[PDB]
Amino acid sequence: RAKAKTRSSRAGLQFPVGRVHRLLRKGNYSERVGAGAPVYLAAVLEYLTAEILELAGNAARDNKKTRIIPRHLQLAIRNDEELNKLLGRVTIAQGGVLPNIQAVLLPK
Amino acid sequence: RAKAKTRSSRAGLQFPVGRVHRLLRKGNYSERVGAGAPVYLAAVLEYLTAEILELAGNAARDNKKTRIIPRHLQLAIRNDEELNKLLGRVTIAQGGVLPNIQAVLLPKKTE
Amino acid sequence: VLRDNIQGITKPAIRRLARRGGVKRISGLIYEETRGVLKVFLENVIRDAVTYTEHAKRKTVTAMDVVYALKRQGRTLYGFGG
Amino acid sequence: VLRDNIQGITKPAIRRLARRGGVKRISGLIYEETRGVLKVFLENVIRDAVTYTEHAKRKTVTAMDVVYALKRQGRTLYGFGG
Amino acid sequence: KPHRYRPGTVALREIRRYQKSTELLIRKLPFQRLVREIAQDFKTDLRFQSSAVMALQEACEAYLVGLFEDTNLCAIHAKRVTIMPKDIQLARRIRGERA
Amino acid sequence: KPHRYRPGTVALREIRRYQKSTELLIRKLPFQRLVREIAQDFKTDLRFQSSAVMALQEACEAYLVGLFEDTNLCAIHAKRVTIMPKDIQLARRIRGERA
Amino acid sequence: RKRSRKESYSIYVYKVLKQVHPDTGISSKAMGIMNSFVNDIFERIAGEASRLAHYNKRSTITSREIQTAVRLLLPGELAKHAVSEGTKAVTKYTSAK
Amino acid sequence: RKRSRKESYSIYVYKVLKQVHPDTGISSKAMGIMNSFVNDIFERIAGEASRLAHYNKRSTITSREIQTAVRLLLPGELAKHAVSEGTKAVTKYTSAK
DNA sequence: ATCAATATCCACCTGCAGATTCTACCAAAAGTGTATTTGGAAACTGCTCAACCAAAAGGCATGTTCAGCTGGTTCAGCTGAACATGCCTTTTGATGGAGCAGTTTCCAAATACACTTTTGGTAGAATCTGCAGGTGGATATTGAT
DNA sequence: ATCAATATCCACCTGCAGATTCTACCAAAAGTGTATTTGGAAACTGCTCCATCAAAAGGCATGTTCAGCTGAACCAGCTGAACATGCCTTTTGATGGAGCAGTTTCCAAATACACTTTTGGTAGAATCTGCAGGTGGATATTGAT
Prior knowledge:
The complex is a heterooctamer, with 2 copies of chain A, 2 copies of chain C, 2 copies of chain E and 2 copies of chain G.
Chain A: H1 7-11, H2 17-25, E1 32-33, H3 36-62, E2 67-68, H4 70-78, H5 81-86, E3 91-92
Chain C: H1 11-20, E1 25-26, H2 30-55, E2 60-61, H3 63-72, E3 77-78
Chain E: H1 9-20, H2 28-42, E1 47-48, H3 50-77, E2 82-83, H4 85-95
Helix pairs in contact in E: 3-4
Chain B binds a DNA duplex through helix 2 and strand 1.
């Protein structure tokens, strides 16, 4: 009975591999689930989470705020071409819009 | 060993209830499937087929054709508001479009 | 109150929304059209939300019912669970 | 000599398509924009089609790969199987 | 004589102000009443959670802002600065919101 | 002197003719060559089924006709009858085809 | 001896067509379009039913989930007539055991 | 004694945030938004992997289907960096048995 | 109105490519019987919602002023629609091998599945600190001149 | 270009409203050992795909002409932005009791599964006929007169 290790630590990840495995089994996605699928998926979710938080933290520093709020997430997403494509039809609650005024109407 | 009666005839339907049941089991939709689900679904699919074929046969008679071709299916769908909504983002191969010309560019009246 | 209805969605609130949209000047006839458009959107969403409600044999519409109704119209909403 | 091969989608074919769209008069600059638009659309579809090809370990692009690629772009196509 | 800003300057100030903040711009109570009236015609004696109403308000507001954005681009396209019903009808027609 | 129709009448005849028929309007072979080049930039020595090419052709033409319809509405909206690149860019921007 | 086996809804569509319009045929392409249509509606309904069952912590898909899915996906009178046909079919099935 | 148990991704998001920006907190609403986000991407990927498996008559979902789904759903460089991380993770797992 | 050069509708004919039907083999659809598990229904409970008065207070209604916005009118390039002309790119068999999509059969190998043993994650309680709210001055933004 | 009158920042204090951390425990993660399906390696094979010719003809690439079109000013209403004043729906704080969302438990009825057994579905072969082309004629449109 060797000591209890977990898969997130073995894979070098923070996200929970085991829970993702259970969620795949439970949800009628496939009859069986391979060992590598939840590791790969967890890694992808971790990378994307880090990227969003990175940009929101940058936006947070521009506003001199130490805590991330939804506004900073909306600004991060809409200012990133690829995230905007991925989330082009998604509504971020309490996000607002980008300070974008069409140039021709702003004053002489 | 009583004689073989199909589920379709018992339901008074033409579509195959048994095949639909097999397709629900095979496809990871639910772990188990109730007996009434495939009957209901088969009835809905049969009704919609009858509606489309009905409108398509009317369009066929309009063009003096006895055989339904894809064109008639496109005309049937786009001229029916509810089918157009259901299939609004669907492309019918070899379907074409409706003879729709925007009214203001077609020729002048005092002519 | 003036219609017991959508007219409680006053002109200045619609103006504010247009301002957030970057609109500088607004015709007087826009307001009723916007109200109708809003009413249609709402009707479809509420219809689906209530349908989910009815399926569960519940008499209370939850936030999740709305999120799913919005999801099927391609307007996924984040922040209210799921 | 051939013409970078995008040019085989000739001006008269685009004109015909515009005619099916109910378009009566067409500026000379439309054609290049249309070619770029078509290329983008095609690029995305074939990319997904080839991805489906690679996953199946097949060397022949089938109609089903295209149909699925189109499905994921919200442009479901009927008439070529499935 | 009172100080007076020319037409458009204050509108721009409101645009910058409301695009900087995120608070909801529609009143909570009439929205709840509208929701309840519409729901009444489908099923009687329904109740609503407060977060369901906040979700609907957020969805409605995000939908309308997006439509005013598309409308403004259509208006600007016609060499105008005033949005009109035909611009809204155009935006909704092109998105396929066929009503 | 040769008989001569005014500008617009035959264009209208072409509209009625092509809206009555369903035949493919783009040439098969150039489309095949375009497809093979693009695919070559993703993966080498790929082959294609003929029905895959026909499916792509149907999709392309349905997409373009829909875009030209929206473009025409945008042109008419600007009190014009001639479509211009800015009309296409507007139509694609409103659909969210951001490219 | 090799020969595989590919299923379609062709024979059933043709039976329904003969029921609604006895004096009328159909091309092979149109039958293919109808088969594609049927497959699409099948997946849409089953997928929606699946999400409802998951949201309500329900492991079974019954005729209730189908009915609800139909009311959500189809508009007005089309939904009402289809639901009526499904209900009548289920009552006929349950009676004639 | 009654008390239920609602799971969330909150603790893992907070750990990642402290790894990327040690001197930064996060509100509860934003955390809820991130949890919703994760659930959405989960459902999208698993659903796409499921369809790929069904089309190729395969009953097993492997890291290959995840990879393919990722390449289809995510664009360009985002896909390349995420895919790289997944491959790295599976490689570390398989070696540290 | 008149009237002549093209386009299109319509009557009829023809034959062959694809629609329709017939006949065979078998994978899949029903029937029995048995084992599994789960959905309906009843009891309970405390979390949440509908009603609901008081007040305060920030927002909305109506009316007035007038500034510049919009659509009607008109006019000088202009350029993109039709034809004519020639030509050369695309169509439609025909060949004709190359290679690969199935198809089957075997076998290590990845993984469900029952059981056992911990321990990570979350629900409630105890500290904590970043910014909501308020305010005091220091500059940025436009209108009239 | 500068004064006048607002707007909004630059900066600070406070304390409190959520936000972070501590403690507990139990439900899910993880280990162990058995049983069961599955991906892939290799052999067969014949269906379909790239490449080539071949002869033609139908679309298209170039060039020529001018008719409505596009943009562009000018200006006469005209109606839609801003503010005052003032009235009031909406909002915040309470209150509190009622219904039901949600959890727990039990059991007839619903349903998976293994074996068996008949037969509806489908593939290829054999009809057969509806419409793609083709011929001729008869209205019906544009456009100059």
